Amino acid sequence: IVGGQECKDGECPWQALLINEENEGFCGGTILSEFYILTAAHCLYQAKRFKVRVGDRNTEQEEGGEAVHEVEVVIKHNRFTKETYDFDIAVLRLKTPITFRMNVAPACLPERDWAESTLMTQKTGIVSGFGRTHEKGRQSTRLKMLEVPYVDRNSCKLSSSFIITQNMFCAGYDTKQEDACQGDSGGPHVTRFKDTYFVTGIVSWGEGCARKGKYGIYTKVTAFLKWIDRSMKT
């Protein structure tokens, strides 16, 4: 996360971190239930083997609440391709169930039509992760969050070198130096409605990080609510 702030205790409980063989975080995820994590399909390519860590807020300190989970099944969307980055979504079924507690709780999945008309129309959403704090810099050792404005689809297409599909949405800022970045990929983009946070996007890609004239691109979760439901029912 470039800009933004560190999440306070209990503020981003649905954050999950995918860790590679080197025990280093490389992508985020969103807790959906005690057995499932939502992440980006492209993240599955970045580490031959990986595990999932929940409850962590500081990767340099082991604190109460952190726990590691092995992945039992990976369900990657069959239409994902790096050629377009379209359909950038995967669901992970964990071998053992997550115990919800302080800093570990699922984000809510909204109903499709309602989300389309009521959540996606809000002014902003919140993105979080342990990714780079600058395009060319190091990944954050602390969990960060950032409020990102929804960006008009047409404005986004005009700004983008690549095709923005209906399975994607844009958010962030034109020139303000705040954005998600590499390492945050796969992580949550949630939108608050009254007092409940609904997962609305999956950090997917961007041309650089916080670049002037560029936005953050997210997988639009509403386009895949049925796919997620079917995936979660094995």
């Binding site: 209990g10 919800f100 999945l109 009521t118 007092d195 946070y197």
Partner: protein
Amino acid sequence: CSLDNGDCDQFCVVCSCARGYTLADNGKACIPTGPYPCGKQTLE
């Protein structure tokens, strides 16, 4: 529903809620059935 979300706490005139919640008596608010309902930040 196009107005004040039908006065609904969550989904919308008929209000409904996400898993882990139960529609309250007033038929608008949503009540968590557990200590860690989805979408709620946690507190000690």
